[PDB]
Design a protein around this nucleic acid. Structure first.
Lengths: 37, 134, 119, 122, 51
RNA sequence: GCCCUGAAAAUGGAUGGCGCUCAAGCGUGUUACCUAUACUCUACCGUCAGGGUUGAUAUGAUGCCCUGACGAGUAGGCAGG
RNA sequence: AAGCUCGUAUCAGUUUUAUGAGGUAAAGCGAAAACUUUAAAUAUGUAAGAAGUCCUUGUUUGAACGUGGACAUUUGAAUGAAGAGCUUUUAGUGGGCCAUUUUUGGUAAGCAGAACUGGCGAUGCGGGAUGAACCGAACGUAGAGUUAAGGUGCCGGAAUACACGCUCAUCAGACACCACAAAAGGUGUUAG
RNA sequence: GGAAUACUGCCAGCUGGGACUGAGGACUGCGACGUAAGUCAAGGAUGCUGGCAUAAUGGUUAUAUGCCGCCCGUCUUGAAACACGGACCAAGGAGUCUAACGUCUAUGCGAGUGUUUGGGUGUAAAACCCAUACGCGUAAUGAAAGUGAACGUAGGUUGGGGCCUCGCAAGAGGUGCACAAUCGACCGAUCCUGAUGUCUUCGGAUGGAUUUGAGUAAGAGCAUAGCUGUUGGGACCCGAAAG
């Protein structure tokens, strides 16, 4: 999605990227838990 | 845009006959509008107080213009002075009629009006408020 | 060259992602990350607004009203001149009228008869 | 207009009408539009009291404006109501009718034979 | 009440177009034309006849 | 290009039938002719639209007159009977 | 349906003119297809004046955020038309096939997905011997006339018409196709 | 060298045969021919003659002949069929009543409106008369305590139907009802501003920045009836497996 030219839906591409960042952060939180336990 | 009064008022049909003939042979737009109004239902024919008549006679050079209310002319105990100008209308509630006459007016009706002014010269057509009940 | 909200734009490209690829719509948001455009898209018989973000590497500024500008100048100036010195105006555009007669003279253009031989 | 004709070529049979056929078509099927009422010409004052604004004050002035395409030709041509012709009185002259006039059919440009077809359809 | 066709009905035809009377009076539908004697060009005869 | 083989079962059988062979077959050309609720013109019904008329001495004004175009119809809708 | 605000100088399943893009490639000429200028429609896209047009200064010369002042109708392309608009409102509706065209992927062969446009349903009538989808076709009651699609041996209204070629089949063909058996054989015939 | 014919086209060229129709119902128009009186193929058919007068024409009906015509209704709408109902006749037979809200229209009165719980009277379940209350409406907004709608000609602005003025109009000016767009005003709630002063915590000043309300900004409702909508009652009619 950060590649093509138009999306046909505040740009939603940046929103895609920030959503993925929240996802990998949830991964990191559930990994910090697992490595604490 | 209905083309006949849905009422079987004998007198309303007589007035519609008069105003069809006048609108057909005068070419003064006052007749076209007064006729088109004579076809209006009861929720589209709302009442005009005597207060709006006073507030309209307040205008410039509207001193001797008779006012014409196709609907009915109710009363308003919230004023304390009425001018002395002729008012013509369909129906006059007895309060308003007594007020107009006590100040000195004349509640001619629409056919005395037809005689007094066929083309409608020197007249104010007042329409009451409508968007109240919704 | 920078944008402002509401100027009729064009589009272009530098593949098979979403082919409008030629439409002229109005921009609505001059953002750094992208430019958003509205498109009049027909669904059955229904001109709808389609909102779409684009990257500014494939967008050019339409100039479709420059002709109207130039012709406003032409026509106003012409009718002013015509009010100055009074002759016929004909200050309206016309379709191509058909040509009239003329004599095509053969003194050096003698005709040459050819068929699909080729020769 | 040429683009319109190219577009509807399959469904019409157009051509270049001449003076004689214009004249007979207008004396016979000539009906004017007056208050949206297809009134037959049948007169002169009829034409006159609607096309007097453009100086067309007979039926020959009208035929003149139509044939020597004039400044008010849009006005004359919309005053006339679309002629409603009869089926051709000698047949269309072909077995099958929906091919281009060039392929031995009947639709499309027919540059000069439209006079013959129309006189027959009159 | 009834549309009467010109191009017949001489009365209608002369009601419209008061000129049809002189048309018929001079026989203008069968008017001649003088004998022009412009023999044409050899180049035109060639490019017609010749292949 | 026509023509013949170029495969297909099982009650009797279908270029629709009869029949056709310088065709009543195939390609093509010029004419003439036949026929739809289609197209033109006319008369009548109805609806819609545009004009006119509440004047005696005679009417039905929700009427009377003049003009033009149109008419399939299920669920539904409106109107007159 | 009603209300109200116009009889719109307004709109249109349309063309043009402008400028768009996809330029396939016919350019052609380059430095020797070698570019890149470019082109027809191929098919869409937005725009073509009344609030427009400007003339005169307050503002972070620019762009205008403010004025005031001129050009009503040659007032700004072709064609058609009056049914255009906006508020309240109210009944049925929701299932689904065929074809065409644009396009993506397919394999024994069909085909599957899209998008658009017809048709069908609610719809009779002429023709195709018969018929959901094929060819014509604007359904009040009648008269006359002329034709569409299809036809003209007889059934059956209408030339056993006219003209040029071809073919003989021990079950021709009249086919409907711009499909399948279809690649071939043949000492049948005709023209190249 | 000089012709004619063919083909194509034009005539407001002449001339003949056939078919269908004859709507309208004093005059008015456009014309044309004639000096004019007049006449006419010009805003729709008349003139002359015959036969019969009643089953001759027309209507009804049985049949014959030519051509056409798949059996009705329902449900699936595609083998658009299948399937389901149909022996025949008569009578019966299925969107009704009521309550509550709501809509559109009609009528009465109108800042009002509503007589019929009840009383009076009566020719007696009718009609006629009537007091006191009560509902809705004429005031909103707050979670609540509570507070509660004029700076102005009830306001400027932009349109706006009608009317006035000018001139013949076009056009121009004047005023502009309804309603709409916009900026203001007022009341309630929210945030601050915090007094005159106070039994010291009560009192609540000025202004602004917000928002918001079917808010006000010279009222429009109340009642009855008809047509309709929704919900609830057996609820368009018949039909189920039960507790």
């Amino acid at each position: 999605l950060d590649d093509q030219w138009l999306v046909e839906v505040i740009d939603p591409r940046t929103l895609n990227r920030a959503e993925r960042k929240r996802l990998v952060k949830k991964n990191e939180k559930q990994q910090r838990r697992n490595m604490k336990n | 845009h209905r083309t006949a009064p849905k009422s079987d008022n004998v007198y309303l049909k007589l007035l519609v006959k008069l105003y069809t003939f006048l609108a057909r042979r005068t070419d003064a737009p006052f007749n076209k509008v007064v006729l088109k109004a004579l076809f209006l239902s009861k929720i589209n024919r709302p009442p005009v107080s005597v207060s709006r008549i006073a507030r309209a006679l307040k205008q410039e050079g509207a001193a001797n213009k008779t006012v014409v209310v196709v609907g009915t002319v109710t009363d308003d105990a919230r004023i304390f002075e009425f001018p002395k100008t002729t008012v013509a209308a369909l129906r006059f509630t007895a309060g308003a009629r007594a007020k107009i006459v006590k100040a000195g007016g004349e509640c001619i009706t629409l056919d005395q009006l037809a005689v007094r002014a066929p083309k409608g010269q020197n007249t104010l057509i007042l329409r009451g408020p409508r968007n109240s009940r919704e | 060259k920078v944008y402002k909200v509401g100027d009729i734009v064009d589009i272009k490209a530098n593949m098979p992602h979403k082919f409008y690829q030629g439409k002229t719509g109005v921009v609505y948001n001059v953002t750094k990350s992208s430019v958003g455009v509205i498109i009049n898209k027909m669904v059955g018989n229904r001109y709808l607004e389609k909102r779409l973000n684009l990257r500014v590497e494939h967008i050019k500024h339409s100039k479709c009203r420059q002709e109207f500008l130039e012709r406003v100048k032409a026509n106003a100036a012409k009718r002013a001149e015509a009010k100055a010195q009074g002759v016929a105006v004909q200050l309206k555009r016309q379709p191509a009228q058909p040509r009239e007669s003329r004599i095509v003279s053969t003194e050096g253009n003698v005709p040459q008869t050819l068929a699909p031989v080729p020769y | 207009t040429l683009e319109l004709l190219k577009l509807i070529e399959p469904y019409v049979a157009y051509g270049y009408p001449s003076y004689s056929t214009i004249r007979q078509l207008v004396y016979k099927r000539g009906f004017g539009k007056i208050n949206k009422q297809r009134v037959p010409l049948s007169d002169n004052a009829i034409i006159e009291a609607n096309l007097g604004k453009y100086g067309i004050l007979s039926i020959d002035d009208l035929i003149h404006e139509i044939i020597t395409v004039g400044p008010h030709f849009k006005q004359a041509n919309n005053f006339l109501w679309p002629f409603k012709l009869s089926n051709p009185s000698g047949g269309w002259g072909v077995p099958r009718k929906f091919k281009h006039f060039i392929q031995g059919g009947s639709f499309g440009n027919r540059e000069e034979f439209i006079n013959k077809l129309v006189k027959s359809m009159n | 009440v009834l549309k009467k066709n010109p191009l017949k009905n001489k009365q209608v035809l002369l009601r419209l177009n008061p000129y049809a009377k002189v048309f018929a009076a001079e026989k203008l539908g069968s008017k001649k034309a003088e004998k022009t004697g412009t023999k044409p060009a050899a180049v035109f005869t060639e490019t017609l006849k010749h292949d």
